[PDB]
Write a protein that binds this DNA or RNA. Structure first.
Ligand code: NA
Length: 92
DNA sequence: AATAAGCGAAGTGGG
DNA sequence: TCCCACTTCCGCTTA
């Protein structure tokens, strides 16, 4: 099964949900979710995973928090809904 | 208050 | 056995 960071990177590369997520500085790997349209993207994540319950942005962000300990994805301080892929994730 | 967002122990998958 | 990679639940804090 695809991992959450790869799901998000693939969305950013494809442009398929441009109203829900976008690059802020692609060279740095920084991206941001839409306040108003993030739930649609969270829903897609849960459907792609085949999870039992409906996925919410809150649950998806709880998973993202675990990446922050390992550095896979860092949450940008002093910003909302903004994150940054590690250099390793971006190299493929 | 209402709403949004940040923060951070037990249950489920698939090894 | 016991870790992976989240998922779900619960609830407090900050804006
Ligand atoms: Na526990």
């Amino acid at each position: 099964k695809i991992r959450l960071y790869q799901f998000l990177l693939d969305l950013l590369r494809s442009g398929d949900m441009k109203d829900s997520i976008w690059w802020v500085d692609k060279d740095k790997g920084t991206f941001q979710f839409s306040s108003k349209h993030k739930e649609a993207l969270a829903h897609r994540w849960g459907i792609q995973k085949g999870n039992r319950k409906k996925m919410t942005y809150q649950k998806m962000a709880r998973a993202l928090r675990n990446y922050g300990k390992t550095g896979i994805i860092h949450k940008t301080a002093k910003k909302k809904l903004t994150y940054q892929f590690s250099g390793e994730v971006l190299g493929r």
